[model samples]
Target chain A: ERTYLYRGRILNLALEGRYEIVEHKPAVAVIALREGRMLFVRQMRPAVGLAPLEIPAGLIEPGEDPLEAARRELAEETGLSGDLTYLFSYFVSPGFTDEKTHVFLAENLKEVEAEDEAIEVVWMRPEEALERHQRGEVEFSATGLVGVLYYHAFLR
Target chain B: ERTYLYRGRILNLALEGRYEIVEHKPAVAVIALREGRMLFVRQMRPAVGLAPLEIPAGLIEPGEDPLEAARRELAEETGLSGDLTYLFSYFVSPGFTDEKTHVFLAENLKEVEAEDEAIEVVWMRPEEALERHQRGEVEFSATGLVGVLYYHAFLR
Candidate 1:
């Protein structure tokens, strides 16, 4: 009852009965705090055409562990690294895609960098990020809100 | 620079300069607290194969506002309705999908029912829900986690 329709980079399309499914690689996101600011990444996302602010995140590579992926993504996108503690993970949208995001809390930051993906590192206070979203000044990616919420719930 | 690939009932696939983009309808989720237990929806998701615990959520119909959609979905899925307050919205996964989810908090519940989607209304205490996730007993959808975080950040 399942049929494959299209196979491409990032995701594949499939159908099971009347339900449409998209197979996507699980991703990892890092939440790192430094001084009084949070590390966020701003990159032009071709999918949405607007670069919504998000925590440092990327798809997990084949054979790579989620922890390693989080560290690598943090270093590559935000030019920072720290001790990471696994917070939790959730399916982005279980209704249509099996894309999961593993979230980690990173602290005791150290400098690290390896980027060329047109990623711009933006450091903002968590409260400011939430306020900006509330004011409709900028949209937030799920990971971004997770970072803000985690900060308010635990760090603060 | 965008080219269409496939148009489906829930989503559309497109390509823009080597990047795959999935255009999906925006969704809404309801967070309702009754006593100490939170309202959650459990349904078989053909995409993930496992029914993850999520808040009452559904895609916004054409010409339907997010708040209206939230109320309708809450009633249809949970057999209850309440005063809804728009919390915030976030792009589920902006890297490759344009799917956004608007979250709302509902209170002062009233009885309402219109279900046929084989959905199970599971009322769980927020702390227990978080503990269950930590114990690896169940996975959470993005909306579920958002509700937990919101409760911890503000309600508590």
Candidate 2:
């Protein structure tokens, strides 16, 4: 029998028979810091059909850990490399999705190479990001939103 | 080709190339206040595997708007009803899910017959709810959390 756990928003079944995860792919996001500024990626999302302001992010390749994925993604998406500091990982939604994202804070970034993409990179101050969030100028990606929220909560 | 706007949490596109919106029920909750006490319920949910404390809530059946749903859900879930104030609605997560919920502030509630599952109809001070949240005694739903956050902000 399948035992379902109700968390109000979703019904989670026991992680045994009759309940298996459909997709389980670990991913990573490179949070670049250079001269006290954060780098962002504005890319066209085919699903939404328009460019949305977000961060440079990608999935983990097969047989790859999150940090490796972060390194590869940072290079592929931004043509940059850095010393990646893995911060923490958390489930995006334990209710409906098994999606988890690992956040890495990159430092001493260098323009090693570039990959062709339909994306534009922008750098801004953390405070500037908060201002943009307040003005609804950018859609808050998970890490971006959390970063800004926690920064102001403790700093200012 | 379909023109895209922005990419968000993929709002479940069905296998046959159709967007799935199985349910779009407008529901309401009564943040009813009376005699310096607020009505609350501890209904069983088989989703998260634990019953979190919450206020009166109900589903908006077909052909019903949120106000009516609030009134009905208030009664059905807690067996109490009163005047309801429509506040606003929000998408719980635009990046992953397309679940939108409406918020309300109910007041001037009067007691009536309790429902069958009204196991312990407690008249709690609003502060108690906050305390429970702080103590981690109550894991609130999205609406439940939003209601309290809004109230706390408005009280300032």
Candidate 3:
């Protein structure tokens, strides 16, 4: 009882019974903390028309596990490497979309040349990021919010 | 700068500058706690083929504020209403979609008959939910995860 309506680069749209199902590639996000600051990425999202402060994140590659995807995304986006510990995973929104994000904590960082560009990187304390979001200074991607929350719940 | 491909019940597909963008209605979620137990809803998500634990949530109707939406959705889905206070909002996955969800904290809840059906309701401590996730007994929706994190960070 499923009918696909559109297939695209990042997602596919299908109708299952009466529900709209978005078939998306699973994604991974990295939460790297050092000196009490969390690594973040800012890149324009055409869907939202503004670049929200986000954690280093990307979709999983065809043959990669969530851990490898997390490592690659962390290295390429933040230009840092660390001992990545798997934290948890959650569906971004299960009501309509099946996009799940695997989260990891990266520590003992080492700097390396990034293989990506056009994305600004910043490091801020979790408290500061939450404060900014409250003050309407910056928006948050789900990864950004989760990273800050995880920090306060465990590391902080 | 935008070319829509498929417009459907809950979302629209579009292409913008080689990026796949999903235009989705903003959503709202409610977090209600009573007797050290957090409220939860479990419903079949055809997209994911399984029910993940989620908070009371629904899409915002046109001309309704997020707070109003949260209240209505809470009462409808969980058969309870309360003094709702807006907590915060986050884009579920801004990397490829524009589905922002506003979260609310509901206090002094009063039960009423639910206006919805086909969903299972449960109450558990936030810690228990996380433990079950770790034990591979359950999955989490973003709202469920957010509600858990919020509880640990402040309420707990």
Candidate 4:
């Protein structure tokens, strides 16, 4: 009797399923503002097989907090470094995985030296994002959904 | 080129997923409350291969609505029925499945004068069921989580 047992194809399970967290690193999202518009990035994801537009975010490596990760990611991807405020943290997909995402509200945007090769850094309004979503133009990831929803909720 | 989608098992170009609706029938939960006790059923689930302790619930059949289905299921399995109130309707697992469950809070429960052979119903306090979950004795389902949480949220 294999009670409390999980079963799946080993190969398929390898490609997908729970990855043990050696450590839980917090992350951040940049809500960078310029006058009245928000800066966003068009990010590519191979696993999802699609590129989705989203705000800047990154992982908290080792000693870094999620806020720091967000700052580092923003600077690395968009050539911007600024202050961030914690919004909240939530488990994105708790059923199949244990990945807690930390969100932030970034302000006082400014240009800085960056590292990663980002697709495109453009400034747009949240309404524009929602419009794209409604018009079937914005391809969004799960994290992007939460970030946008929370931002809009607070914005309204 | 075929677009990839994540839901459940797939057949060729067809994606298969499960959905539960409330429609017109009221889905019922047999609280089986007596002397401050609640009756719960230990249900055998072949999908996860686990015997889970659950509050009685059934699908609101097409054209029947959630309330009717709840009453029918409770009476059919446990030979009991009572005042069932529609609670909230939420996606059981929004990320993966379309299994939306309609939660109902039951009160004034009475025996239906009949019992089915397929079910093993047990009576326990809310605290007891939670302890079972903590001790790894009961495999709690999504409905159970929402239902019990709802109960505690309003408890005096």
TM-score for each of the candidates? 0.97, 0.51, 0.97, 0.46
Candidate 3: tens digits of C-alpha lDDT, residues A23-54: 89999999988899999899988889899989
- Candidate 4 residue lDDT tens string, A1-156: 223222221101111222211112234566666765667776544323346666776666778877778888888878887778865444322322233456677777778884577457867776677578657676554344434444554454
Can you tell me which runs of candidate 1 are displaced by over 4 Å? none
- Per-residue alpha-carbon lDDT of model 2 for A30-147, expressed as tens digits? 6766666677776644333334445667767678988889888888888999998865454432233354566677878899995747667778777797667557566554445434
Candidate 3 vs candidate 4: the TM-score winner is: 3
Give each model's whole-structure lDDT: 0.90, 0.55, 0.90, 0.53
- Report the candidate with higher lDDT, 1 versus 4: 1
Candidate 2 regions exceeding 4 Å error are A1-24, A150-156, B1-11, B15-156
RMSD of each: 1.3, 8.9, 1.1, 11.3
The local lDDT score (0 to 100) that residue B61 gets in candidate 1 is 100
Report lDDT (Cα) of residue B45, candidate 2. Answer: 50
Lowest summed lDDT across 10 adjacent residues in model 3 chain A is found at A111-120
What value of lDDT does candidate 2 attain over all alpha carbons?
A: 0.55
- Candidate 1, residues B60-125: lDDT per residue as tens digits? 998899999998898888778899999889999999999999999999998876474699989999
Lowest lDDT block of 10, candidate 4 chain B: B17-26
Residues B1-156, model 3: lDDT tens digits: 789888888988888888988889999999989999999999988889899999999999999999999988888888898999987789999978899999899999998773688777889999999999989899999999998988888897
lDDT of 1 by residue, A1-156 (tens): 679888988999888888888999999999888887999988988778798989999999998999999988888877778999999999999999999999999989988764756988899999999999999998989999888888888788
Model 1 clashing residue pairs (backbone): none
